[PDB]
Design an enzyme around this catalytic site. Sequence first.
Site, PDB file in Angstrom:
ATOM      1  N   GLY A 132       5.875   6.948  -1.157  1.00 13.40           N
ATOM      2  CA  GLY A 132       5.803   5.841  -0.106  1.00 13.40           C
ATOM      3  C   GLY A 132       6.667   6.071   1.124  1.00 13.40           C
ATOM      4  O   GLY A 132       7.582   6.744   1.021  1.00 13.40           O
ATOM      5  N   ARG A 154      -1.394   2.210 -11.154  1.00  8.94           N
ATOM      6  CA  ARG A 154      -0.785   3.543 -11.639  1.00  8.94           C
ATOM      7  C   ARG A 154      -0.179   3.418 -13.150  1.00  8.94           C
ATOM      8  O   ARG A 154      -0.139   4.404 -13.803  1.00  8.94           O
ATOM      9  CB  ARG A 154       0.323   4.096 -10.532  1.00  8.94           C
ATOM     10  CG  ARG A 154      -0.265   4.528  -9.241  1.00  8.94           C
ATOM     11  CD  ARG A 154      -0.882   3.407  -8.373  1.00  8.94           C
ATOM     12  NE  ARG A 154      -1.145   4.064  -6.971  1.00  8.94           N
ATOM     13  CZ  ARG A 154      -0.366   4.628  -6.209  1.00  8.94           C
ATOM     14  NH1 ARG A 154       1.120   4.298  -6.344  1.00  8.94           N
ATOM     15  NH2 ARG A 154      -0.827   4.971  -5.021  1.00  8.94           N
ATOM     16  N   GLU A 193       0.808  -1.068   0.232  1.00 12.81           N
ATOM     17  CA  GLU A 193      -0.149   0.107  -0.092  1.00 12.81           C
ATOM     18  C   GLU A 193       0.914   1.285   0.055  1.00 12.81           C
ATOM     19  O   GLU A 193       0.712   2.066   0.906  1.00 12.81           O
ATOM     20  CB  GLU A 193      -1.062  -0.070   1.299  1.00 12.81           C
ATOM     21  CG  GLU A 193      -2.388  -0.646   0.988  1.00 12.81           C
ATOM     22  CD  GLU A 193      -3.173   0.327   0.105  1.00 12.81           C
ATOM     23  OE1 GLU A 193      -4.482  -0.044   0.083  1.00 12.81           O
ATOM     24  OE2 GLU A 193      -2.649   1.146  -0.426  1.00 12.81           O
ATOM     25  N   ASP A 194       1.609   1.202  -0.905  1.00 11.44           N
ATOM     26  CA  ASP A 194       2.427   2.546  -1.138  1.00 11.44           C
ATOM     27  C   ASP A 194       3.542   2.756  -0.194  1.00 11.44           C
ATOM     28  O   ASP A 194       3.691   3.812   0.613  1.00 11.44           O
ATOM     29  CB  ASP A 194       1.494   4.019  -1.606  1.00 11.44           C
ATOM     30  CG  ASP A 194       0.820   3.735  -2.833  1.00 11.44           C
ATOM     31  OD1 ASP A 194       1.081   2.669  -3.339  1.00 11.44           O
ATOM     32  OD2 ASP A 194      -0.249   4.336  -2.567  1.00 11.44           O
ATOM     33  N   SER A 195       4.287   1.691   0.104  1.00 10.07           N
ATOM     34  CA  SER A 195       5.484   1.835   1.114  1.00 10.07           C
ATOM     35  C   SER A 195       6.411   0.916   0.553  1.00 10.07           C
ATOM     36  O   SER A 195       6.674   0.459  -0.438  1.00 10.07           O
ATOM     37  CB  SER A 195       4.837   0.975   2.378  1.00 10.07           C
ATOM     38  OG  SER A 195       5.781   1.283   3.407  1.00 10.07           O
TER      39      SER A 195
END
Lengths: 67, 46, 115, 63, 1131
Positions: free
Chosen positions: E900, E932, E759-761
């Site tokens: 992230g 994306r 999750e965008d990390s």
Amino acid sequence: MIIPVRCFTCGKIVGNKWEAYLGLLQAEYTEGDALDALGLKRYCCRRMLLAHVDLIEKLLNYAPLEK
Amino acid sequence: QPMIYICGECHTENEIKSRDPIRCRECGYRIMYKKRTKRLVVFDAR
Amino acid sequence: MNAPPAFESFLLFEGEKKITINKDTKVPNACLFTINKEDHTLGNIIKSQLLKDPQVLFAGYKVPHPLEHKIIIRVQTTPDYSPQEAFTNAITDLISELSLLEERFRVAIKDKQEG
Amino acid sequence: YGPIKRIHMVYSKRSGKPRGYAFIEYEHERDMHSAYKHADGKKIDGRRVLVDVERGRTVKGWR
Amino acid sequence: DEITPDLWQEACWIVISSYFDEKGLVRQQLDSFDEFIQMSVQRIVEDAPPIDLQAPPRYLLKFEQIYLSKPTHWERDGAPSPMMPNEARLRNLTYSAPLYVDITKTVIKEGEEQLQTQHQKTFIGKIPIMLRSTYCLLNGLTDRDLCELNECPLDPGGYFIINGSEKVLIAQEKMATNTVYVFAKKDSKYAYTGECRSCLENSSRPTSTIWVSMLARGAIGQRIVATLPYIKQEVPIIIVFRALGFVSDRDILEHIIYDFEDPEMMEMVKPSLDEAFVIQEQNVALNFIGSRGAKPGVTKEKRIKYAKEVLQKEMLPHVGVSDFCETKKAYFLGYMVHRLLLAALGRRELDDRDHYGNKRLDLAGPLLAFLFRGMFKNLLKEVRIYAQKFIDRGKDFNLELAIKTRIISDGLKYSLATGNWGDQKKAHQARAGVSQVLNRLTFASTLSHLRRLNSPIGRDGKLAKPRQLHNTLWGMVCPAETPEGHAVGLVKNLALMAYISVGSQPSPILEFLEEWSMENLEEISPAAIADATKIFVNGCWVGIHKDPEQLMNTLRKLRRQMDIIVSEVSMIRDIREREIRIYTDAGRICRPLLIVEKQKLLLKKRHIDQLKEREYNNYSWQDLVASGVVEYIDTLEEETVMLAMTPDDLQEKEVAYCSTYTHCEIHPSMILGVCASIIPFPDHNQSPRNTYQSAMGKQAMGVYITNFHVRMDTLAHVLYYPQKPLVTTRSMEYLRFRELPAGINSIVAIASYTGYNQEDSVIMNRSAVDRGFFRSVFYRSYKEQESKKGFDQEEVFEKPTRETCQGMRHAIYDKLDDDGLIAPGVRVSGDDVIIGKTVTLPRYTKRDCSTFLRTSETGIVDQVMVTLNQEGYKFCKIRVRSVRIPQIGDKFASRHGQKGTCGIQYRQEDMPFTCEGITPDIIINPHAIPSRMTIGHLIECLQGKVSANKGEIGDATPFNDAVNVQKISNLLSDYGYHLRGNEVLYNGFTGRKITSQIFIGPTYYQRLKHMVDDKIHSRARGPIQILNRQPMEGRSRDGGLRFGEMERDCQIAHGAAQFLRERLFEASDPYQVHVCNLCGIMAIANTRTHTYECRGCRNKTQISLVRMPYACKLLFQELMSMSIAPRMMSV
Ligand SMILES: [Zn+2]
Ligand SMILES: [Zn+2]
Ligand SMILES: [Zn+2]
């Protein structure tokens, strides 16, 4: 702003390769052949010498605070 | 007690006491810089 | 603000045991070894060495959390055997293997240095 | 004190070293006089400097 | 001679480098201010009317010339000394220069006894100067000389310095003036509305907007009206035509309809004629107009006078405000109606409000001129009253005391300092947002901020039409660089090759046209307008022509030779509509383009040769334009221009598409801005992603300026080891990103390792962080000064003492010196004191007012500065240094929107590795690629792996057919790696291989200033406000978090009443009050003496205690102030 000591990925010393790297480029050497002569095979160490920007050389153009 | 300051143009170590307008006696520059303290500061190389 | 000291990963805290044994009640002849200030370096070698023992029915390791520096090792053995005995032999076997590997390395280094 | 049309810094003829004095030519005669009173006593590079209208070609019997 | 396709890629970028070597990145800001000082100010002074005042003796006080010296500073002794920008940023001064104007005062009393007195070089006021401008001290200085002054040679300038704050004027967009635009509102009494914001060449009044509307169908037909200025009632167009001296309907229609053979238009205007036929003379028409206004004169005489001056001054001032010009106004007003008929009859398309060819960019030049004009009037005013009250006594006056120089100085200073565009009193009618604080977080943000635009439509607006990316943003604006918040599409960013016109006078062009076969407007007959072509200049209808083809060919030849017509002049020849609009106004955004002959370019090989030896033969961009090879094209002219994306389109194809090209693009990548050009392969990623990156590039850490050790900025983030991107674009060489990068090339591996990167990390290498990976330092400057405002109380820097000072916290003050300021090299933590300041009282005779450090800082003092402000008082600046190590929570982002936070930091031993000891510095979750669709992140990771193993710098230019994914793959297979970048990894915990061959390679990542240490916040029984006893707001004030309405609604659904009570009453503002059980009003309680009484009811026994929030008690008190009686009845 100045060449780091170690490579962030592996840990190989690179601080002693910047001056030698520049001395080779002015000798009509290619960036690849120069990095090979210095013993930089992994693309991690080659990144440090090929992507570095010697900014300290520009910071030394300003007079210091004390004479 | 001395409180020696530094200049920005001449870099002369001049003494400046309180209640005294800031001005370099050597060059007249109006901006003064303080000198590095004498205390022992530790820096962990980490 | 909260960066924990780096040495806190290897140094044992005062009043804290390096290893704690807790008998598992779910199945018989099983135990849980909660070792503090360790990582996957020891859990795997002990795990692998435990699987090679036919009297060991279950041998595994886990890290409850990466930020912590503790480890939990589960050991299940046959009724005639004991888990603590397996955790001990697995270490004794690993020590001998490294001692033999160490000696055989000096010889190889010596043979290579000479010719 | 005013725009400078031309500036002339004199140098040693044989040694080439800087003499230490220069001639400043302002665009307007009024701009110069403003410096006569203010320029005199200025501090440049830590050394006080004096400033007076050049009399080499103005004052009669000057040398 | 001809540039071959193989050599084109080298020629185009060579031409670009010459452009940036002569113009620069902020040329539009410098040229604007330059033309303002050279022409605008001198013109504003001459355009002012001589103030003739008499009691008798009279005085005119006429100005003739101005002189603006260099920026200067006057101390208390008065010694004039030059002030450097570094001295201003440090002393919190204003980098302004004095304005010297020549005045001539002639005495005229009687008997022709005149005598003139000239006051040469009168100090009228000070003006802030734009850094690096012509008058700036840093003009023409070499990189070495600028270093002596502690200035960065790379600093582009284009900004001011007011009180030590670097302010930049944001170009404000506005609708073009002197132009006719026919719109159509769906919900309005008018079907079509033709407006024209008119303003004279030398602007002196606001824009007099005149409307020429058509009444919607449902007497007999559609009536045409005209909403003139200073009139609150619609007026038929015929009445206006008659008020100008045209009573005959034939002459009127001759000015509106140029071809009487078009009965469709004549039938459409008939209703307006039949609506106004009782009036047949000029005098009656003027009387009617004056009657419709809000100032109906009781006598018809002054009614006609009011209309006469209105039609002569307010109606179409750009066409002329003098007398005898009624013919020109009618001819234009006729064309204004002609445009309305064509729009209603479908013969012409309506104009788009978003078309930038119909907009203008107000830069510092046209902006500062508006202020100087309004203030110069106020100065001549204050000078008038001053001298007036003196001549009334029959004696002379000294103008030196009449000139209130404080007007101009404090005025320009306030506007550029606060942003309110207008007088200091009109702080609400003025439009804010202008003159923003220059962003010094990275070189990209500075360039973007200096090249920023702004549309004053209002962020409150929810209409998507003005925010949409119009087709006209091509080449002039970055389609990607734009905020994603509540200002999408409004706040834009100029393109790399975008140049906003500075302005020019149309006098020489009009002279050439008059010398040409062109016919004036008053000399022609309306019958000749049918087949003839119109010619406009800055919106002013000048005349007509017969052979416009050879006319433009001549005008174009003149502009290409740097002839009378300058390059910034736009010449649009509408062909269907015979109009020919020429423009010299400022704000016309334009860009350069390569002229094209029949089928070939004019940029031959001999040019590229001279441009290569640019440092020897001084052959720069200017010599290229003068050769007629390049042309500055504006948005309004692009409509009549047929561009070619590349010379390849000019070659002969199996099927000819156009075959009649007239212009060509230097490089399509120039349509991108500053923050978007740094993105490699932006044509391979989803567009929003390129936009989110353009907003992050300004938040990326790096080296915002080379001279960061001298600048004492309040916030500055410096990266330890900056690196230039291995995968770079050929435009970075001009943005100077190679010299001042804002990121580090990281060996990233796109894989799921323990799930800490989901999750965008991202997962970082703790060992790399230990070697200085993305490590940075945080510089914070604290300023303070001792004020001697008056003998009542005076501040002074001095080491406080527990026996004399009053407001001394429990913190220890030992770190301070006798001077009251801390010394560099000292370790300072939160709550510590750095400046010991004490204020004299009216813990006796002096109170402590020391400046403490912000909480949770734990920094070290880098340096300390002491100087004098404008008021001659002591001024100290302390720059604190704090090393920020990238840890869990710090935000990282690549050049493709992949943002992230560092989920966890794994050591080199716990991280994966290839067959060789190459661990990835960063690990991202692959789930961020598909949604994306950031393919550029994968190709960058590939071209970076080829560049590092090959020994070069990857060329990731957006539109370059010579570099694709296949060529990169083949080059990677030669160095012993998988052609698709994948590589076998080994689990660092067990050493076992990973079944899925992971993708790994060098990728240029950036660190953002949004760290967790600056956002972590907690509160437990902290301070509270004064008005309402509720927690404060902000970390600096130890405030609490907001339990908003949406939270009240959520907990209501849960049925959690106790929680909702504990959060809103017990944990926010618990309070107790005493009310009378009869009137329910708050009684007077005294818990010390145990007496409770209500004065109203005169009772002291029927009182009840109520536990209610303080805000409610405050509400009831705020209501009782309005005579409302909220009675809390407890029964
Ligand atoms: Zn390495
Ligand atoms: Zn000094
Ligand atoms: Zn009562």
